[PDB]
Enzyme design. Structure first.
Site, short mmCIF file in Angstrom:
data_model
loop_
_atom_site.label_atom_id
_atom_site.label_comp_id
_atom_site.label_asym_id
_atom_site.label_seq_id
_atom_site.Cartn_x
_atom_site.Cartn_y
_atom_site.Cartn_z
CB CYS A 299 2.91 0.36 7.30
SG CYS A 299 1.24 0.28 7.91
N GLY B 163 2.69 5.64 10.20
CA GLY B 163 4.05 5.60 9.73
C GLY B 163 4.81 4.35 10.11
CG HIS C 218 -0.47 0.20 2.53
ND1 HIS C 218 -0.39 -0.82 3.45
CD2 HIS C 218 -0.12 1.33 3.19
CE1 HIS C 218 0.04 -0.33 4.60
NE2 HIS C 218 0.22 0.97 4.47
C1 LIG Z 1 0.85 2.03 8.10
O1 LIG Z 1 0.69 2.60 6.82
C2 LIG Z 1 -0.52 2.17 8.82
C3 LIG Z 1 -0.46 1.64 10.29
C4 LIG Z 1 -1.68 1.96 11.18
C5 LIG Z 1 -1.93 3.48 11.25
C6 LIG Z 1 -2.21 3.82 12.73
N1 LIG Z 1 -1.72 2.66 13.48
C7 LIG Z 1 -1.42 1.60 12.63
O2 LIG Z 1 -0.99 0.54 13.09
N2 LIG Z 1 -1.56 1.46 8.07
C8 LIG Z 1 -2.78 1.95 7.67
O3 LIG Z 1 -3.12 3.11 7.97
C9 LIG Z 1 -3.79 1.08 6.85
C10 LIG Z 1 -3.55 1.11 5.33
C11 LIG Z 1 -4.54 0.32 4.45
C12 LIG Z 1 -4.15 0.24 2.97
C13 LIG Z 1 -4.71 -1.10 4.98
N3 LIG Z 1 -5.16 1.43 7.25
C14 LIG Z 1 -5.59 1.24 8.55
O4 LIG Z 1 -5.01 0.50 9.32
O5 LIG Z 1 -6.72 1.97 8.96
C15 LIG Z 1 -7.08 1.91 10.36
C16 LIG Z 1 -6.58 3.13 11.15
C17 LIG Z 1 -6.84 3.26 12.52
C18 LIG Z 1 -6.40 4.34 13.28
C19 LIG Z 1 -5.66 5.33 12.65
F1 LIG Z 1 -5.23 6.38 13.38
C20 LIG Z 1 -5.35 5.26 11.29
C21 LIG Z 1 -5.81 4.16 10.57
#
Ligand SMILES: *[C@@H](O)[C@H](C[C@@H]1CCNC1=O)NC(=O)[C@H](CC(C)C)NC(=O)OCc1ccc(F)cc1
Ligand SMILES: *[C@@H](O)[C@H](C[C@@H]1CCNC1=O)NC(=O)[C@H](CC(C)C)NC(=O)OCc1ccc(F)cc1
EC number: 3.4.19.12
Lengths: 297, 298
Positions: B142, B140, B38
């Site tokens: 991921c 950030g 992603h």
């Molecule tokens: C890494 O890109 C990120 C890790 C998430 C963000 C906040 N804490 C984490 O462990 N991944 C994502 O944002 C992900 C991407 C898609 C393509 C799967 N989406 C996601 O996890 O949405 C849920 C979310 C919850 C809380 C938040 F603050 C932000 C996003």
């Protein structure tokens, strides 16, 4: 969760130090290896070691220092309090930017537990108010170090020397001065009565709120002095005005006044948790500082 | 206590990968960088992406890979399930001995939490039976990875992709296959109800015995099937043959057969603790594996 600092900068400094049949770990910075001075003891020495007398009788070649497959030649030695400083003929190219600090009770640090100069595990510890640490250390762990990392700078605060009969641990700063009333002799030593680190319990309650957990909150409040009277009764450390100030950021973020959280903690101390849990724990956790909570949140 | 592995061998492999303004972490091993696919999504594409279509619009020169501030030139790219593999023109000189492994529920691993390619902290995680982990992951993070270290060798088992509505975390192995039923889309997804990791509770009871805390040992035994049927009534996982085997060493160390310990656990489930404690706790711990127990006791 309990999060430790990444340990790589410290791993690059760990070596093995052997004298006689005693082996422990050393910390190799520039051209000096730091280690616990009791490496020079034998069995007939540990009970009452006159370290200056034992040390003058040692030669540089009695110290075997091993960095991986490589032996580092000791070209000099000196003792600073309970730490031995071995000068070697090789600089550690992996030496990080570093400083030596003496930490205050209630502060936290990461421990890199090592055996035979090889890193084994990393975990977060707090300096207890009675100056012990609740570590996980086994035979051969001496010379393992505790540290914090700020930007790229490693602040070493702890070197490991012993395990007390209660299973807690004792050691020195990197100047070789013990935390607490302990001595590096093979005798059973008791610590002073431990107390709970109140400012850390409050930081951890604020953390439980941030993560959407607030069953323990209440509509009551308390003065600082009245809270401290109850805290001391339950062998909690007193909360200072600096502690309250330090907790400001967490108070703002959550909208919960510090003294309101003190009123919550007072209720928990007087009522217990009644089988409930907080952030998974059946007990009040006191080894997260306000900074630890803030950083991770 | 939860003890992580020393993180240095993994720190030496972390990089950052950017597409446009989307930045996450990657894992640099030999001349390949692995990261969540992603990264190719715009924040608006994450709502439901067509990864194959998005990738066709990409070229090698669209990927910014950096170790610190030093760019690594990308010379090929491919998608494997939910991970991107970026071939780079430099072999990482800090590459450890490594392998890619797919772990089972209940197994623990260390997570090196990273932001912008820079490690922030290391902690121990358990893979829950519902294939989530209780991470501490922020925006950030991921591409941060989970791993175990055996002898010289880093076994990478987890790469982080997303947070679920309940605050727990989901991700893939290093071949890009999600743990559990999750998909990398910014849609509402739910984890199955979680259960207690029986094999780890048994490990914990063995650890209690090793430390001389053994009031809960009863004189009974049970079959594996009878135990599994009872345990599920208490929201405990059934045991597999592999679970029985990985308790072998602790069973040998204590002389307590696995099925006898199961009978002791069954009594604790059916009758409760009766106000007693084990290892100074009224709660049964389920995030220490049999290996973790041996790691710490030795
Ligand atoms: C890494 O890109 C990120 C890790 C998430 C963000 C906040 N804490 C984490 O462990 N991944 C994502 O944002 C992900 C991407 C898609 C393509 C799967 N989406 C996601 O996890 O949405 C849920 C979310 C919850 C809380 C938040 F603050 C932000 C996003
Ligand atoms: C490192 O050399 C080692 C680490 C100890 C061993 C087990 N767990 C640890 O944390 N240190 C010692 O063994 C230490 C050495 C002395 C010279 C300071 N002593 C020790 O750990 O035991 C203290 C003790 C002595 C007598 C007694 F009756 C009870 C405890």
């Amino acid at each position: 969760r309990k999060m430790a600092f990444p340990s790589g900068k410290v791993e690059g400094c760990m070596v093995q130090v052997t004298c006689g049949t005693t082996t422990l770990n050393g910390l190799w910075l520039d051209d000096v290896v730091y280690c616990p001075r009791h490496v020079i003891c034998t069995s007939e020495d540990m009970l009452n070691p006159n370290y200056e007398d034992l040390l003058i009788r040692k030669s540089n070649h009695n110290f075997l220092v091993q960095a991986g497959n490589v032996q580092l030649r000791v070209i000099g030695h000196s003792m600073q309090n309970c730490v031995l400083k071995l000068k070697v003929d090789t600089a550690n190219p992996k030496t990080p930017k570093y400083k030596f600090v003496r930490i205050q009770p209630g502060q936290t640090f990461s421990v890199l537990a090592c055996y035979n100069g090889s890193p084994s595990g990393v975990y977060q510890c707090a300096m207890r108010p009675n100056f012990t640490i609740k570590g996980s250390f086994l035979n051969g762990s001496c010379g393992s170090v505790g540290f914090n990392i700020d930007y790229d700078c490693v602040s070493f605060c702890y070197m490991h020397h012993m395990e007390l009969p209660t299973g807690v641990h004792a050691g020195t700063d990197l100047e070789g001065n013990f935390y607490g009333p302990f001595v590096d002799r093979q005798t059973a030593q008791a610590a002073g009565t431990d107390t709970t680190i109140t400012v850390n319990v409050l930081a951890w309650l604020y953390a439980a709120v941030i993560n959407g957990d607030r069953w323990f909150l209440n509509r009551f409040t308390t003065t600082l002095n009245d809270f401290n009277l109850v805290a001391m009764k339950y062998n909690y450390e007193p909360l200072t005005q600096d502690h309250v100030d330090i907790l400001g950021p967490l108070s703002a973020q959550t909208g919960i006044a510090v003294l309101d959280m003190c009123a919550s903690l007072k209720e928990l101390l007087q009522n217990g948790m009644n089988g409930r849990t907080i952030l998974g724990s059946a007990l009040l956790e006191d080894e997260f500082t306000p900074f630890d909570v803030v950083r991770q949140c």
